Amino acid sequence: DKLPYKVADIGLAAWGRKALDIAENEMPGLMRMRERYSASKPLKGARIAGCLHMTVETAVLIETLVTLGAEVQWSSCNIFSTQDHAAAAIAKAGIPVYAWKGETDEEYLWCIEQTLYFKDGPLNMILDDGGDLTNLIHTKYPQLLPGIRGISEETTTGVHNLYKMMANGILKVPAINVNDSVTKSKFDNLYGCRESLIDGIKRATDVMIAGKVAVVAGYGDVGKGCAQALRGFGARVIITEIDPINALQAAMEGYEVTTMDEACQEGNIFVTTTGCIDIILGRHFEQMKDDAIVCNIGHFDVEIDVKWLNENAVEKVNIKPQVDRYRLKNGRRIILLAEGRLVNLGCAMGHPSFVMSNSFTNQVMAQIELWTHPDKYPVGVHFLPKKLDEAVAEAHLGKLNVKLTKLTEKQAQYLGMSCDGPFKPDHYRY
Amino acid sequence: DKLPYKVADIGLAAWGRKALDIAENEMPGLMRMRERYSASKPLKGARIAGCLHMTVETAVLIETLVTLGAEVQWSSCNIFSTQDHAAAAIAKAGIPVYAWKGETDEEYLWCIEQTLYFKDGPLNMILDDGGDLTNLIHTKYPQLLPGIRGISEETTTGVHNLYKMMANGILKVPAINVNDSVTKSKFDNLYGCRESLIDGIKRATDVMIAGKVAVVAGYGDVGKGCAQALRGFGARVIITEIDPINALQAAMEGYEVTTMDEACQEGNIFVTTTGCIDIILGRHFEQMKDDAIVCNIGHFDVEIDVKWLNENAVEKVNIKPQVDRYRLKNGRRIILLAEGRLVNLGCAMGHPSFVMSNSFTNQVMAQIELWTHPDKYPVGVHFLPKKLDEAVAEAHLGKLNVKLTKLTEKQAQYLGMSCDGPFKPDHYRY
Amino acid sequence: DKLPYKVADIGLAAWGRKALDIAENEMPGLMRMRERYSASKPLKGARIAGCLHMTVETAVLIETLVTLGAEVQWSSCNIFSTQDHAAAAIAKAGIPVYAWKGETDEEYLWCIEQTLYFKDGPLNMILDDGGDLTNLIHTKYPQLLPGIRGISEETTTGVHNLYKMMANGILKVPAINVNDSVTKSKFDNLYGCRESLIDGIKRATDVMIAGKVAVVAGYGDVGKGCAQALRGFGARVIITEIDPINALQAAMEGYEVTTMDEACQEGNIFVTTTGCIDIILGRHFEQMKDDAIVCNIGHFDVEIDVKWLNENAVEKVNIKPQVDRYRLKNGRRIILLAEGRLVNLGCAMGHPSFVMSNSFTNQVMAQIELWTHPDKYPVGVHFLPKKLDEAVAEAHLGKLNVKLTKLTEKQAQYLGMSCDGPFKPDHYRY
Amino acid sequence: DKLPYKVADIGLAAWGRKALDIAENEMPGLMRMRERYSASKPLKGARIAGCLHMTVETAVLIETLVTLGAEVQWSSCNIFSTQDHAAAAIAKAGIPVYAWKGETDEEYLWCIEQTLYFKDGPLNMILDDGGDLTNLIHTKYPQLLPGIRGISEETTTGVHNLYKMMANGILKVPAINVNDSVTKSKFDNLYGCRESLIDGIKRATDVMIAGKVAVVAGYGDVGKGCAQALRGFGARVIITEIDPINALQAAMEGYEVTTMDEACQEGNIFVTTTGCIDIILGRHFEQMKDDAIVCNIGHFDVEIDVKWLNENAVEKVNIKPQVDRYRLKNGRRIILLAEGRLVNLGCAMGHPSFVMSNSFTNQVMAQIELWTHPDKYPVGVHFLPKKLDEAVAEAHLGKLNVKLTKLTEKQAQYLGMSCDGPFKPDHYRY
Ligand SMILES: NC(=O)c1ccc[n+]([C@@H]2O[C@H](COP(=O)([O-])OP(=O)(O)OC[C@H]3O[C@@H](n4cnc5c(N)ncnc54)[C@H](O)[C@@H]3O)[C@@H](O)[C@H]2O)c1
Ligand SMILES: NC(=O)c1ccc[n+]([C@@H]2O[C@H](COP(=O)([O-])OP(=O)(O)OC[C@H]3O[C@@H](n4cnc5c(N)ncnc54)[C@H](O)[C@@H]3O)[C@@H](O)[C@H]2O)c1
Ligand SMILES: NC(=O)c1ccc[n+]([C@@H]2O[C@H](COP(=O)([O-])OP(=O)(O)OC[C@H]3O[C@@H](n4cnc5c(N)ncnc54)[C@H](O)[C@@H]3O)[C@@H](O)[C@H]2O)c1
Ligand SMILES: NC(=O)c1ccc[n+]([C@@H]2O[C@H](COP(=O)([O-])OP(=O)(O)OC[C@H]3O[C@@H](n4cnc5c(N)ncnc54)[C@H](O)[C@@H]3O)[C@@H](O)[C@H]2O)c1
Ligand SMILES: Nc1ncnc2c1ncn2[C@@H]1C[C@@H](CO)[C@H](O)[C@H]1O
Ligand SMILES: Nc1ncnc2c1ncn2[C@@H]1C[C@@H](CO)[C@H](O)[C@H]1O
Ligand SMILES: Nc1ncnc2c1ncn2[C@@H]1C[C@@H](CO)[C@H](O)[C@H]1O
Ligand SMILES: Nc1ncnc2c1ncn2[C@@H]1C[C@@H](CO)[C@H](O)[C@H]1O
Known part of the structure; x- marks a missing residue:
């Protein structure tokens, strides 16, 4: 009795697919993730519910996750941000998406609700942007918390919420602060x-x-x-x-x-x-x-x-x-x-797709981290490891034809660091 | 048996009018021309045929000219540049406009042809952008040349054409190079x-x-x-x-x-x-x-x-x-x-409307010049006087809240110039 | 009974020569002039009196002129602009220079006076910056005017003076406005x-x-x-x-x-x-x-x-x-x-030497023009021909490794211009 | 038998004092420290040995510390960076400084050595730039370590050294990383x-x-x-x-x-x-x-x-x-x-004095911190508290006429922070 999805017009899927084709070519970080994990499906078992602007960029992220094996259900985190052709292409690909440009507030909440329960069981992962999904679960569906292995959060405001929650004993699931990966905050936000x-x-x-x-x-x-x-x-x-x-x-x-x-x-x-x-x-x-x-x-x-x-x-x-x-x-x-x-x-x-590739590569890494290595993430708010942060950036250098320099062993010894990094202390501000 | 106009959809006039209302507020040079000449109608008698991208900005220009008393018939100077809501607002206001986004080449020529003959007699003025109308008249309708008092030309390519024509005894009507007014070339083009x-x-x-x-x-x-x-x-x-x-x-x-x-x-x-x-x-x-x-x-x-x-x-x-x-x-x-x-x-x-106000104020001035003072313009290619060029700029300072300095009589004597300008020699490059 | 020169300290010549060596390597326009005219001495016969800041750059200009065959006597056009090591290197090379950093006003005038009369006869050429030498001759030594073939003027203020003089029947010698060559005003001044x-x-x-x-x-x-x-x-x-x-x-x-x-x-x-x-x-x-x-x-x-x-x-x-x-x-x-x-x-x-090479190449060209082709310069104020202006710029491209494009004959015909230029009309503002 | 100081020429003190007068007026952070602590002498008892480029800026820092009550002995941390007029003004003021532009390497080391022992006892504080003094003490004078309460370090390279030392059990005294205060690294270095x-x-x-x-x-x-x-x-x-x-x-x-x-x-x-x-x-x-x-x-x-x-x-x-x-x-x-x-x-x-005021206000704060609150600093490498970092910046706003906004209590509650800060989490990168 539940809709399999809800979009403005499924008829826009063809134009949307063309949009995603161009975008994919601007998003090497996401494409390289698929190239590395489609075979091993590290996200197999994950039932990821996403609440993040339903745009062309987000559609490439959604399909990257699916390619990595997870089951995904999505909603937009703003009533006016969905790009209907992108939402239609996703719906058409048979992914449950509930989003359209110009939702009313009641509908906005309704859409998030349609992502909590999958064909085979509630969500076991959250991919949030702003904290709305995170706050909905912690306040109306706490019972689902034990079944959620992790949260990855996209933006400054959502990250601030998380720290307010953790400071107040409310945060019940491990969370990775994606906004504050260097490759996100100093690129996407700027x-x-x-x-x-x-x-x-x-x-x-x-x-x-x-x-x-x-x-x-x-x-x-x-x-x-x-x-x-x-x-x-x-x-x-x-x-x-x-x-x-x-x-x-x-x-x-x-x-x-x-x-x-x-x-x-x-x-x-x-x-x-x-x-x-x-x-x-x-x-x-x-x-x-x-x-x-x-x-x-x-x-x-x-x-x-x-x-x-x-x-x-x-x-x-x-x-x-x-x-x-x-x-x-x-x-x-x-x-x-x-x-x-x-x-x-x-x-x-x-934001254009290339910079969104930096943000979403961080997001895929966070999902894999939490899902694949929960023993490494106690309840609280964490940062992706600098080594992964640097890998996000390196994955985008080839598209720009950047020729990066390699430290000689002599140089690496003088600097007291590995030739393959991390190249900066944890407090580095870039 | 002739269409009174031809646009994509007259139904877009309301949205277009809203567009022109906002634009008018960004175009003080054109608004100030209307405020100064609506009463005296210096263009009364002029039958201006325009060939220039049919956009919101051009619609404000067209209505400024009409307000100054001329009769106007317009076509776009590019098959893809017309803004249909602007063309509809003009058509609706009862001005003959033949333009829509996406014309075929034959239609493009057809549209220019519908502007040559007015209710009461052929064109006696040309407002061109690129030289297409100018070249059409000189090559297919020379007979109409004696009846044309002047040409004002908007862009670099059209201006170059004019100098090629003048160098070859072909130019038969006085022309004002609007592209090269300082307030056009160093603002619109840049x-x-x-x-x-x-x-x-x-x-x-x-x-x-x-x-x-x-x-x-x-x-x-x-x-x-x-x-x-x-x-x-x-x-x-x-x-x-x-x-x-x-x-x-x-x-x-x-x-x-x-x-x-x-x-x-x-x-x-x-x-x-x-x-x-x-x-x-x-x-x-x-x-x-x-x-x-x-x-x-x-x-x-x-x-x-x-x-x-x-x-x-x-x-x-x-x-x-x-x-x-x-x-x-x-x-x-x-x-x-x-x-x-x-x-x-x-x-x-x-280009946004504010900078287009600089270009189109120059265009209105050129039309008035040629129409109102033909004795001052022999056949050839001319520049608007620096004093008018400076006036275009001064008319846009108030909107930006610029407080310009006034030379003291002492200073003006030292510099050997008038307190009210021109403030630069004719070869000045700005 | 006249000093052969007057500088702060001849002992600074060695450091100055080192300065000029480095500068020469930054001034391809001046070096290329020497390479082209040292053999033919187009300035042979010229007795050039210069009044222009006595700096390292000006020393390279002075020696370029001498290399081209003229006899030169120089003074600075400002009491604080002389670079003593450059003035000493020139003095030492046996060129009469009267200049030092920190002159009094009476001395400033004295120095200009020592440049008017050469070993073999008064000046037959002026190279001015600001009009001071130009005004001194026209007001205190008019008798020397018939013997002066030309004036080349470096700056905006001097050029403005010249137009005030020409407008008042005072200008008695042909003058080339060097400030307004494009390669001077849009490079040196900016x-x-x-x-x-x-x-x-x-x-x-x-x-x-x-x-x-x-x-x-x-x-x-x-x-x-x-x-x-x-x-x-x-x-x-x-x-x-x-x-x-x-x-x-x-x-x-x-x-x-x-x-x-x-x-x-x-x-x-x-x-x-x-x-x-x-x-x-x-x-x-x-x-x-x-x-x-x-x-x-x-x-x-x-x-x-x-x-x-x-x-x-x-x-x-x-x-x-x-x-x-x-x-x-x-x-x-x-x-x-x-x-x-x-x-x-x-x-x-x-200004650094490279940009000063643009200005001084213009100055050398002006001197050659007036000296070598006086029939081409009636009394008044003129501009160097655009073709020479473009040549100044082209002479500096190699040092910067600029690869300029050459018009195909097809393209040159379409544009109605020569493959070797001028590439712009005379009113072009760049 | 020890020199009371060693500089290039004490005769330069007058020019130097004029230099410091102008600089003081560009350094509100240092001036405001003196205005707040000259009365209470929080550094009374401190015997600060400094090794940091002996410039006009550093002279204002040295006198700020003395004003705050410490005894100071200084050396430059580079053989070519000392500004002799600044070193002379300091020497003259009777502060022991051993520095001149153009030292040999043996002299460079000699100068640092003359700062270790004061009239009344060895150094009890280090103010370093590059780690040279820090490394000299830890390697040749360890015996003096128990008597040293703290180290404040100015630059990236010195800070990196400190972390290498701490990682190797060598660091024996508490150290504050001044390079990495935000108001230093994102202002001085940039x-x-x-x-x-x-x-x-x-x-x-x-x-x-x-x-x-x-x-x-x-x-x-x-x-x-x-x-x-x-x-x-x-x-x-x-x-x-x-x-x-x-x-x-x-x-x-x-x-x-x-x-x-x-x-x-x-x-x-x-x-x-x-x-x-x-x-x-x-x-x-x-x-x-x-x-x-x-x-x-x-x-x-x-x-x-x-x-x-x-x-x-x-x-x-x-x-x-x-x-x-x-x-x-x-x-x-x-x-x-x-x-x-x-x-x-x-x-x-x-660097000009104004930005150096940001760095040196950080340095004075670090000295006071370590000296005045050692219980707060275990052996290791620390950061000044964000609240002090923000205070450095606020102390420079008035000179620039910056009107900062104050959070309303409503806003501060919404943001979950104090109206007086800190306004950012500790991982903020600015
Ligand atoms: N629309 C987008 O694509 C996108 C991308 C990144 C982040 N965001 C969102 O943009 C906003 C800010 O992000 P950020 O990364 O810049 O946060 P930031 O913390 O780096 O920034 C904001 C600043 O606002 C200042 N500020 C707070 N209250 C203020 C007040 N009353 N007056 C003046 N200044 C004040 C703070 O001092 C602070 O420096 C957040 O809501 C964030 O989630 C939007
Ligand atoms: N689309 C717009 O809104 C708008 C506004 C202003 C002018 N225009 C048009 O833009 C074009 C240029 O205008 P402009 O005012 O810049 O002209 P410009 O003369 O100032 O410029 C163009 C330049 O192109 C260079 N050039 C010519 N052939 C070349 C070649 N083969 N390779 C490399 N460079 C070459 C020339 O040397 C020249 O400096 C014209 O067609 C003009 O009518 C468009
Ligand atoms: N020091 C140098 O190396 C060097 C190099 C080039 C020219 N110059 C000299 O610099 C000065 C200017 O040269 P330019 O090429 O820029 O002249 P410019 O004509 O291009 O410029 C100056 C401007 O000053 C404006 N102006 C005049 N009186 C004014 C007043 N009372 N208040 C505000 N603005 C006023 C004018 O409108 C004008 O645009 C001249 O004296 C010139 O000879 C110095
Ligand atoms: N002269 C001054 O006034 C002043 C002021 C601040 C710091 N410093 C000094 O400047 C230097 C750097 O400071 P910082 O704050 O910029 O350090 P930073 O860590 O922020 O910077 C330097 C960078 O160099 C890169 N790098 C390392 N080895 C490299 C190699 N072989 N090839 C290319 N890049 C390489 C690193 O990745 C790094 O991003 C340090 O020695 C520091 O103490 C000088
Ligand atoms: N094209 C886009 N697709 C998805 N999210 C986007 C896009 N542009 C900006 N964003 C996000 C919107 C944000 C604020 O909620 C983020 O921090 C930022 O990552
Ligand atoms: N919004 C606009 N409306 C009308 N003409 C425009 C607009 N933007 C650019 N143009 C013109 C297009 C040009 C080239 O044909 C001009 O030189 C320029 O004035
Ligand atoms: N290094 C320099 N040597 C000689 N003249 C210079 C130098 N820098 C600027 N000038 C000139 C000084 C000017 C004003 O008198 C000019 O217009 C400019 O050409
Ligand atoms: N004028 C100056 N006085 C003192 N130290 C300076 C000055 N300019 C730069 N520095 C310092 C030199 C550095 C590198 O050793 C620092 O990190 C920086 O703070």
């Missing part, structure tokens, strides 16, 4: 938003970036990438921060660092990257230049007070999907993107 | 492609730019913008040039300058910006890395040997409109964008 | 200040640039280079301009454009690049942050009101040559570089 | 070399960077800064790496990553930043373009085979101090800077 933040603002508004003042709240890995992207197109970028170290980094890169109370009067474009609530408020909106564009790229839509706009604007015109233009009592207009949900995935296609 | 080249490559392929080698043929104003855009996202950019000066400029900016025969073996992304034929040939395609992306942003599709691919590939798969992926005898794949037609307009939406 | 402005600020103060707000007055070729240099090291750069076009260029590159009245309160570093008087006044100094650094890189020291500081500060401490630190009545301190004279040459060594 | 690498190459050679190919070995924090500096001036930068992660970072920033065996044939400028031996060998020198410039910025001069040049060149000409130009059997020339010793300090003045 270089990925550097390209997909602009993509989302452009597809949504077609606005010229050059000449504009842009305000980026937060200067973490995401803000660093966003600020760099905007400045490369000629915007004057202003940064807001709560952390004196990130603030000093931004100042030393030539950015004016000040508060939102002050910057709201100057910005033409606003991007929130903090992962924190109450960044852009009604008091900020009333000070904004006419047609200021306001978006969020942080995991959850908690940074901008969109409720305030809906309750206080005198007009609200939908320009196209995910693009709303309000008119306030002061007569001025505000362009709001994706109703405040992460703009790169809501208004465009997320 | 900053505009800096943002819309990436937009087109992204919407077409979603490819990661970071980590790639990109080859840009030509280092003129368009190549300069394209190279800068690609390098800002982390691509290693190689430049090809025939001009020792542009080549030295590129080298001094840190770019490797070499030949296409050599670079075709390294590039992952190829962009042609030369305005010249035979840039990328079959011999180059056979040396390319797998899934290399190849596009053109020069006016005409004469830079890449697309015919060679169609005749020599073993497979050709249409991924989506304007995106074709070939498979060659060597087993490797080539992604070709927009069949070789300018990629920013064929795969995306062209 | 890329040269991009490297030597920082060099001067650093050798003078050792100040960290990152984190600072820097204010650059003017956004011409010099301001463009200076702004780019400062921003590359992490300074937040604010620009002041009087020209709406340059102001819009700066805004579209992400720079805040405002007035000095406003920026004087924010800057930590101030650089004037306008070529205009009254840029930084006492009213600006009283608003400055403590230890703000203030310098000028424009030709003459007329941009900053240094007299105001000397008359109004409560203290003035010389830190080292060309570096003065004042203390104002408000208790705050101002660091002034080179007493307001061009900072790159006053506090460092000017 | 932004500092970004400005002082160019300074050293420029003061030494005056070479144009634009147009050159530069090869940077290593892409750690130092290579990242060096590569960014060179590319900002127009050099094409090639990177060599042994670490797949750093290699992928460099590729994604647009740099070609290859081997030295390959790059030695292309580079015009070579900079080694690896901290490893055998980077540039005789086989590399024989392939180099004429007048290639070769330097090292890593701690010890072990990266370049300078011995090979001295033994194999046919000529060796000293251009000026720290600049040697060789001529090889193949007729080509090699410019070697500072005989291979760190170029920023050997040929220029090291």
